[PDB]
Amino acid sequence: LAANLNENYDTGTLFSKSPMQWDNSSNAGFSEGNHTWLPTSSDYHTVNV
């Protein structure tokens, strides 16, 4: 629904590049880090691999 990126990206088509949701973890299991370049969708607890 929204993201705050400090790079030059096309905000009209940026929201369809969210990180892949693998499981229930930190950042849907995509990064295992502190932050991701883009926020994962909020409902990654129900829809993930």
Ligand X SMILES: *[C@@H]1O[C@H](CO)[C@@H](O)[C@H](O)[C@H]1NC(C)=O
Closest CB to ligand X among residues 15, 37: 37
Residue holding tokens 């994962």?
40
Q: Which residue is nearest to ligand X (CB)?
A: 24
CB 3 within 8 A of CB 15: yes
Closest CB to ligand X among residues 10, 32: 32
What residue ranges bind ligand X (CB under 6 A)? 23-24, 33-34, 45
Taking CA atoms, 45 is separated from 27, 28, 48, in Å, by: 11, 8, 7
Closest CB to ligand X among residues 11, 24: 24
